[PDB]
Structures are given as structure tokens and as C-alpha cells.
């Protein structure tokens, strides 16, 4: 089959995403969105950071981890059936192509 994340209506969803700062003392921008990762950026952006902190936020969506140390995992509060679908987590790594793109499947029961 294929990896997926699961939650009942009402609960919080927990979607993982990670990087390891192989060049420490330096962070990269990140963004979550709805829909599979397109060629550039993420889909309907819901949460984004610059190279320092969150510069775009949506009600119900939160970075729950130490994102400055590579935990870019996402909490979604009080989920509904509408929240089912694919989410894109994206790390802006400097270089040609580079960008780490992660599609995470959420299934709401």
C-alpha cells in the first residue's frame, strides 16, 4: 500500500516532517500546503516560514516541533472530513533543484 496518517473527526492530526541542519548555525525556509507538492513551492499554502520564523499562518495549523532544529512536524486542530487529502511539506534547500519535497496523506474517519 502506501504510508498514511489517520485521525477521527474532532481529534488533532499529526503530520511529520524533518530536516537535519548539516550546515548548523543556519536554517532554511519551510512551507506546508494542501495538495501534492507542485513543481515550485507548496499548494494552497497554509503555513510558511522565512529563514527565521513563521511569516504565514492559518487558523488550526501549527508547527508543533523545534523547527529551528529541524522538526517541522505539523498539528491540525479539530479535523473534519474535508481535511482528508494530501499535504505538501517543503524545505527550501539552497542549490539547483535541491528542494526536499514530502507528500503526506491524511485520512479522516
Amino acid at each position: 500500500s502506501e504510508v498514511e496518517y489517520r485521525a477521527e473527526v474532532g481529534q488533532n492530526a499529526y503530520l511529520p516532517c524533518f530536516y537535519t541542519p548539516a550546515a548548523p548555525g543556519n536554517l532554511v525556509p519551510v512551507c506546508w500546503g494542501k495538495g501534492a507538492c507542485p513543481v515550485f513551492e507548496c499548494g494552497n499554502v497554509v503555513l510558511r516560514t522565512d529563514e527565521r520564523d513563521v511569516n504565514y499562518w492559518t487558523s488550526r495549523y501549527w508547527l508543533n516541533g523545534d523547527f529551528r532544529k529541524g522538526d517541522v512536524s505539523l498539528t491540525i486542530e479539530n479535523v473534519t472530513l474535508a481535511d482528508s487529502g494530501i499535504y505538501c511539506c517543503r524545505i527550501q534547500i539552497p542549490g539547483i533543484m535541491n528542494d526536499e519535497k514530502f507528500n503526506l496523506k491524511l485520512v479522516i474517519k
Partner: antibody
Amino acid sequence: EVQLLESGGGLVQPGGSLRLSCAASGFTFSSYAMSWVRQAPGKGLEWVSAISGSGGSTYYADSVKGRFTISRDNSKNTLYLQMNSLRAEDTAVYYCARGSYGTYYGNYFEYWGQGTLVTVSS
Amino acid sequence: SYVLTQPPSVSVAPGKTARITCGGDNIGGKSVHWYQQKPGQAPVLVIYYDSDRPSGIPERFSGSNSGNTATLTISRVEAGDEADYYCQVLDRRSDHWLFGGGTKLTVLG
């Protein structure tokens, strides 16, 4: 400008209860995790309790579990701390604090209030 | 379980550089933040995420973090910089916000 004003501090006897309040302004209150931090006279800072933007999650230092309840009314831009079974060593200045935008926990104490003295004595 | 350690006191001559240690097990792995508290006043956020500087804080304030030591650095020390300085972390293992014991900065001469 961000503003955090504590009220409700004062005198109370060992075993007694008290309710602190923190009126917030100058930002969307619901969008930010809130904490309480305290400091006994001459002592260090000690984190007490925190609550998520929505109120969905609450967190407590061990030394106050079972006694203190943190809560919030987002339609009144107000944070609360219900303090029961108060003890001598709970005597301190109580500071309200706000965390950072888009973080579930808050992560750090970006903005502080001026605090409110709670004294627990017979 | 996770604990932060600071030296109680640090002295420095005016115009020099003050260094305030914050010790913890692989503290490099966690975001460290720094508070200034002048006698009688509420704490002020001086540095966040190791080395970021809040709007309106002088550039003489810098921070670092790697290994077992995080370090707040204050150059060209002036007398107003006397205070207690606390380091701070978020431990998502126990869901506690932790503080170091504090460091008294004293300006000599």
C-alpha cells in the same frame, strides 16, 4: 503595541484559593499560546503553566499539578490561572507571557507583563 | 529530567566583551532563548532561537549554541547592562519550559 496586564494578586492564607487574570491587547489573542511564569523574592524564574492558542492543550510544572488550572476566554482576550491549595512557597510575582506566531506550544516568552504579587501567609 | 546550568556571576570591564554560559546535555540540539532582568523590572527577551535578536535590541547582543554550551555575548559592555540573565529551553519530552539558575552580570571599575 502588545500589552499584557495581570490582575488578581494579593494576600491569601495557606490552603486558600486565588484567581489571576491577564488582559491582552494589540494582537490576535487566539493566534498565540500563553504561559504563566513566576519568581519568588530573590529567586530565579520558574515556568508554571501554559495553554495553546485554542485552549486545546494545557501544560503544568510538576510543582503545581493538581492545584492550578490554566484557561482562557478568547472572546475576552483574557488568560486565567485558578490557584487552589496555595502554599508558602507559591509566594511570588506572577508574570503573564505570550509565545510566538504559528507555534503550537509558544516555544519562548516573546512578550511579558509587569506581573502581580501573590503572597501566601497567615 | 532535562536541566539547564548557568554560572551564578560574571564580571567584565566597561567596553569589553561579556560571555554568559548556559550548559545542558547536547543543548546544541535545542533552541535556546535569553532573558534580561534588571533589578525591579520584568524580564525582557534579548535573544531567541540561539542567536536571533528581537526588534529594538542593540547589536552588541549576540548568541550562539552548539554541543553542551550555549553562549550569550555582550560586547562594549555599558553599566546599564548589569542584570540577571536567564537561558531557557522547551523540553517536549516532559512538556516543560526550563530556565537556567541565572547569571548576575557585574560591570567593574
